[PDB]
Amino acid sequence: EGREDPQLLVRVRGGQLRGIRLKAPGGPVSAFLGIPFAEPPVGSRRFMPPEPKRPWSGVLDATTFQNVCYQYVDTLYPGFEGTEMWNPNRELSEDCLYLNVWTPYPRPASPTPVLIWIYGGGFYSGAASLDVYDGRFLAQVEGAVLVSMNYRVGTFGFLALPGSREAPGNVGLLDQRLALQWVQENIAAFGGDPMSVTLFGESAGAASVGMHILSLPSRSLFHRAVLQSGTPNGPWATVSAGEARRRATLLARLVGCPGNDTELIACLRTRPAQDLVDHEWHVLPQESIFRFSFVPVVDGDFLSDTPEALINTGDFQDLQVLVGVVKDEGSAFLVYGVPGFSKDNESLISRAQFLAGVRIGVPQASDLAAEAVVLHYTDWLHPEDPTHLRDAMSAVVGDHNVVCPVAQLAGRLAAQGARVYAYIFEHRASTLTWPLWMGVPHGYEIEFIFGLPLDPSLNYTTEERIFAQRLMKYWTNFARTGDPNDPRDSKSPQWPPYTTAAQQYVSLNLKPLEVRRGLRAQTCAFWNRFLPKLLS
């Protein structure tokens, strides 16, 4: 003070922040970027739960994105937008526990509903600073307060020797919880309403939102939840205590760390961060798709039991959730090492490649279980047809990992109190750089929900701009009221709740909302009711 914009000075519990007035297409928004919310988790704090940020003096500059959490950089297709857009856009550091706030400009006069975004990336990658998570459009067009946080990924976030003090597990989830606490204490300073906080997230972000729903301390920190293309139940989002111990111990051996828990973790704490990242992928029990080395653990603490036990016995009377999937959940995963598949050709595969693909996609399956999958997905009229085999391989991955875990989740919640709305997102961005065969891949509804197409410089179609406006309106209506439908609007077709009785959900595309029934019901009976029994 006291030259300098007076609408950009805010005090939080830790001291003064100076934000930055950014431009959105329709007008200005306030951004407070790189606010630290924890003591840097470095040195003797690696693998430890986060400690709250100690207060500072002077004005903290909150005008730029801060460091991204240490992680593996994707180099499948170097220079290719389709992969590069998910890669870190700030330097990598273990000092990375910072969050971001976008608010209208000037800041809202009455308490506004808050959306908190939790990025995905297999629990090994992601950053809140990526272009596709820019909160400026929701802030400007919908008047939302939007917050997003960095949380520790990979080993730093999730390496666990369960039972130990030095490496308890789930610390990445604990980072996210600390940011939720920081929102409760501080968000009013920005004109947000701590009594109206909605969590939303996609992929591992979605599974995280889910874990917060199933964890007691978290439940008093938010009111409503959105889970896009991910769930806490299912094959990849968690691991048993035993399995996490196994993986931690193997990684320790692989980097030279040999023999009780204190010694082992102390040695790990002296290894360069990059060394851990360089070995991260070597601890998986089988060759596999849609599996990640270091993920939330079932510790009997953050997670008192498996997500499955918790969804089946929890009381969800007070909860409102929006859940959904994209048309082609599996397709992107196939180019990460499934033989026969690529972004540069049509990936027309053979029957042999489809069976080999299934062993990889369902790694936990016996010979019998795998034959069951293959038989179920074969087109018996054209069983050698390479186009169908390619689409089948895709659907096997997508159904087993996302669609059917989502279906089970929606079903259990609705059955046990929750108001649940469900969607399938079916529009392929006209600006998409992946080939057509991949359809609508994992992650490609995000840029629409966040309103990117409203940026004229981005080259989306006019109808796409209107489409993003609809979606932003649904997401923010849901944040505001627990119901995505416009209360005043009469002309627009209604989005009904999902129920066990009727199993209704909506198509999200360029055409007006169509109500559909049964979310791959038949096939999800195979994956959710039959396959588990067969694995015995």
Ligand X SMILES: *[C@@H]1O[C@H](CO[C@@H]2O[C@@H](C)[C@@H](O)[C@@H](O)[C@@H]2O)[C@@H](O)[C@H](O)[C@H]1NC(C)=O
Catalogue the active-site residues: 203, 329, 442
Binding at 345: pick from ligand TZ5, ligand X, none (beta carbon under 5-8 Å per type):
ligand X
CB 463 within 8 A of CB 512: no
Give the residue from 430, 411, 429 showing the smallest Cα distance to 420.
411
- In order of 162, 202, 407, 535, the CA distances from 159 in angstroms are 9, 22, 29, 28
- What is the rounded CA–CA span in Å between residue 151 and residue 37? 11
Among the listed ranges 258-266, 328-336, 365-373, 498-506, the one in contact with ligand TZ5 (CB under 6 A) is 328-336
What residue type is assigned to position 261 of the chain?
D
CB 379 within 8 A of CB 337: no
Residues numbered 246-285 forming contacts with ligand TZ5, rule: CB under 6 A: 281
Find the shortest distance in angstroms from Cβ 347 to ligand X.
6
**Per-residue contact string for residues 449-488; x = within reach of ligand TZ5 by CB under 6 A:** ----------------------------------------
Binding at 348: pick from ligand X, ligand TZ5, none (beta carbon under 5-8 Å per type):
ligand X
Q: Please state whether beta strands 98-104 and 27-36 pair in parallel, antiparallel, or not at all (unpaired).
A: antiparallel
Which residues have a Cβ under 8 Å from the Cβ of 532 and sit 6 or more positions away? Answer: none
- What pairs with residue 226 in β-bridges? 200, 322
Find the shortest distance in angstroms from Cβ 363 to ligand X.
21
Binding at 186: pick from ligand X, ligand TZ5, none (beta carbon under 5-8 Å per type):
none
Token pair belonging to 22: 């950014």
- What is the rounded CA–CA span in Å between residue 374 and residue 358? 7
With respect to ligand X, which residue has the nearer C-beta, 315 or 344? 344
What residue type is assigned to position 42 of the chain?
V
Binding at 30: pick from ligand X, ligand TZ5, none (beta carbon under 5-8 Å per type):
none
Task: Say whether residue 377 binds ligand TZ5 (CB under 6 A).
Answer: no
Residues numbered 335-364 forming contacts with ligand TZ5, rule: CB under 6 A: 336-337
Dmax (CA) of the chain: 76
Find the shortest distance in angstroms from Cβ 21 to ligand X.
47
- Count Cβ atoms within 10 A of the Cβ of residue 463 and give its class: 0-12 exposed, 13-18 middle, 19 or more buried: exposed
With respect to ligand TZ5, which residue has the nearer C-beta, 291 or 480? 291
> 142: part of which helix (H) or strand (E)?
helix 136-142
Task: Say whether residue 441 binds ligand TZ5 (CB under 6 A).
Answer: yes
Q: Please state whether beta strands 320-326 and 419-425 pair in parallel, antiparallel, or not at all (unpaired).
A: parallel
Position with the least CB separation from ligand TZ5: 443
> Of 13, 61, 76, 286, which lies in the binding site for ligand TZ5, with binding defined by CB under 6 A?
76
CB 53 within 8 A of CB 37: yes
SS3 480: helix
Task: Say whether residue 83 binds ligand TZ5 (CB under 6 A).
Answer: yes
Binding at 337: pick from ligand TZ5, ligand X, none (beta carbon under 5-8 Å per type):
ligand TZ5
Residues numbered 114-153 forming contacts with ligand TZ5, rule: CB under 6 A: 120-122, 125-126
**Per-residue contact string for residues 32-51; x = within reach of ligand TZ5 by CB under 6 A:** --------------------
- Using the Cα atoms of residue 326, residue 328, residue 334 and residue 335 in order, give the sign of their dihedral: negative
With respect to ligand TZ5, which residue has the nearer C-beta, 71 or 140? 71
Task: Say whether residue 443 binds ligand TZ5 (CB under 6 A).
Answer: yes
Find the shortest distance in angstroms from Cβ 126 to ligand TZ5.
6
CB 290 within 8 A of CB 236: yes
Binding at 484: pick from ligand TZ5, ligand X, none (beta carbon under 5-8 Å per type):
none
Which residues have a Cβ under 8 Å from the Cβ of 319 and sit 6 or more positions away? Answer: 213, 224, 225, 413, 417, 418, 419
Count CB neighbours of 502 within 10 A.
13
With respect to ligand TZ5, which residue has the nearer C-beta, 47 or 434? 434
Token pair belonging to 65: 């994105």
With respect to ligand TZ5, which residue has the nearer C-beta, 147 or 334? 334
> 101: part of which helix (H) or strand (E)?
strand 98-104
With respect to ligand TZ5, which residue has the nearer C-beta, 26 or 337? 337
CB 393 within 8 A of CB 349: yes
Among the listed ranges 3-11, 189-197, 410-418, 441-449, the one in contact with ligand TZ5 (CB under 6 A) is 441-449
DSSP symbols for 239-295: EEHHHHHHHHHHHHHHHT----HHHHHHHHTTS-HHHHHHHGGGG-SSS-SS--SS-
Token pair belonging to 76: 């499948």
Task: Say whether residue 72 binds ligand TZ5 (CB under 6 A).
Answer: yes
With respect to ligand X, which residue has the nearer C-beta, 340 or 361? 340
Binding at 342: pick from ligand TZ5, ligand X, none (beta carbon under 5-8 Å per type):
ligand X
> Of 63, 164, 184, 288, which lies in the binding site for ligand TZ5, with binding defined by CB under 6 A?
288
Binding at 169: pick from ligand TZ5, ligand X, none (beta carbon under 5-8 Å per type):
none
- What is the rounded CA–CA span in Å between residue 186 and residue 63? 18
Find the shortest distance in angstroms from Cβ 345 to ligand X.
4
| Site residues (vs ligand X, CB under 6 A) | 340, 342, 344-345, 347-348
CB 228 within 8 A of CB 206: yes
Binding at 329: pick from ligand TZ5, ligand X, none (beta carbon under 5-8 Å per type):
none
Find the shortest distance in angstroms from Cβ 85 to ligand TZ5.
8
Binding at 56: pick from ligand X, ligand TZ5, none (beta carbon under 5-8 Å per type):
none
Find the shortest distance in angstroms from Cβ 281 to ligand TZ5.
5
Find the shortest distance in angstroms from Cβ 434 to ligand TZ5.
7
Residues at the site binding ligand TZ5, with contacts judged by CB under 6 A: 72, 74, 76, 83, 86, 120-122, 125-126, 202-203, 281, 288-289, 291, 332-333, 336-337, 441-443
